[PDB]
Amino acid sequence: GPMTKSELIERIVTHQGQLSAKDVELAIKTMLEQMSQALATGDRIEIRGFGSFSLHYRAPRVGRNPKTGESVRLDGKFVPHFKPGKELRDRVNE
DNA sequence: AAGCTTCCGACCCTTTTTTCGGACGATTTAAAAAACCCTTATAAATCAGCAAGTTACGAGACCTCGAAAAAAGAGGGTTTCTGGCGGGAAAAACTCAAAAAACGCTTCGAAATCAACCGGTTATAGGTTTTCGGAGCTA
């Protein structure tokens, strides 16, 4: 089955129990907040080994509903993007 | 006159100090015993170096007992080091709950993509050098 954030909390807490469990979740949800905020402010998120996690742009377009098929105008906007770093790349490549 | 209380004399018994006598030791003096001297020509000892045979004194050894010293064993005590148990506070699992947040339905058309190779970006592993904190110290 899949791992979740709720399961990360406990597994980190087992492999780093010497830190307070709640200092751990505190840390971990603040650091997710930090990276998401960095994206929301239009910034890189670059690291080594892991990879880099970044932003991309979409131009305005006339899309419209898969259900109803009714014209919908859309303005230009940004979206997150992620490229895996060659260390993680090869770790996940069986 | 009677009863109670307090001295006083008589005495009984044992311990402590003094005096006297007796005994023993030491010293002195006198008496007794052993000894020294004076007469001897003749008999026996003196001694010379070495051999041949013997031993009185020394050395070695062991035992025996007793005592002395040392070592062990015992007992008295104090200081401290550790372990077990008990108790309060914090953490984190456990239980209870909502509200988001994701997922699916479901996308035809818009990105995402990998591939190889160049130059360029930059997070940061690693190392290098240095303020802050604490060492307590001392009255």
Residue whose pair of structure tokens reads 């010497």 in the numeric block: A18
What region does A32 belong to: left with phi over 0, alpha with psi -120 to 50, or beta?
alpha
The reply to whether A7 Cβ lies less than 7 angstroms from strand B is: no
**DSSP-derived 3-state class of residue A69:** coil
For A38 and B108, how far is CA from C1' in angstroms? 34
- C-alpha span between A80 and A34 (Å, rounded): 14
Method: cryo-EM
Domain residues for A91?
1-94
The reply to whether A22 Cβ lies less than 7 angstroms from strand B is: yes
Contacts of A43 (CB under 8 A, 6+ apart): A55
Give the helix/strand (H/E) hosting A37. helix A21-40
Name the nt closest to A18 by C-alpha to C1'.
Answer: B91
